Amino acid sequence: MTLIYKILSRAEWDAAKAQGRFEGSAVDLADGFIHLSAGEQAQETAAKWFRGQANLVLLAVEAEPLGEDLKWEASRGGARFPHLYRPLLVSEVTREADLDLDADGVPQLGDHLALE
């Protein structure tokens, strides 16, 4: 889909937006640099881990052919998540989207995406 997404807490996003920059958080560095996710990957991981969290922000980035810094890398020896090997500047991001839960308490990308 080219538009890859990163989910984080609003409190973190507003702070980064104040600086104009978002450096690699301990969570991202713990996995392997800034871990972005494709639309399908984001929805799944949202249902698994981001469930119950009703204060999330969906950061949309238009891929860009810079595979040198943005690599669709297989984390944990499985799925290929696009990892950015440098700090995420706010002025670099395409658009944001405040994301909330559905009836099951899951981050509802099903309605937010073309799953309809």
Side-chain angles (χ1 to χ4, degrees), residues 66-112:
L66 34 65
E68 51 195 81
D69 296 283
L70 182 64
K71 299 182 178 302
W72 297 73
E73 194 58 277
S75 176
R76 305 175 185 159
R80 296 84 71 191
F81 299 102
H83 291 82
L84 185 62
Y85 292 77
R86 65 176 62 218
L88 182 61
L89 300 179
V90 177
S91 299
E92 192 72 87
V93 186
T94 300
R95 292 187 58 116
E96 65 179 84
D98 299 279
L99 195 286
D100 204 81
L101 309 177
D102 75 305
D104 289 274
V106 174
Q108 189 57 213
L109 286 64
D111 283 77
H112 183 81

Side-chain angles (χ1 to χ4, degrees), residues 3 7 12-13 16 19-20 27 41 46 60 74 78-79 84-85 91-92 100:
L3 279 295
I7 305 178
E12 306 181 278
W13 176 235
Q19 309 181 33
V27 182
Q41 299 174 329
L84 185 62
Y85 292 77
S91 299
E92 192 72 87
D100 204 81

Side-chain angles (χ1 to χ4, degrees), residues 5-9 12 22 28 35-37 41-43 45-47 50 53 55-59 99 107 109:
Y5 310 95
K6 177 178 176 60
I7 305 178
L8 71 172
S9 177
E12 306 181 278
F22 181 81
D28 290 270
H35 48 65
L36 310 178
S37 60
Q41 299 174 329
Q43 203 291 328
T45 306
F50 294 98
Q53 308 182 332
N55 54 89
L56 307 179
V57 181
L58 193 66
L59 301 182
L99 195 286
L109 286 64

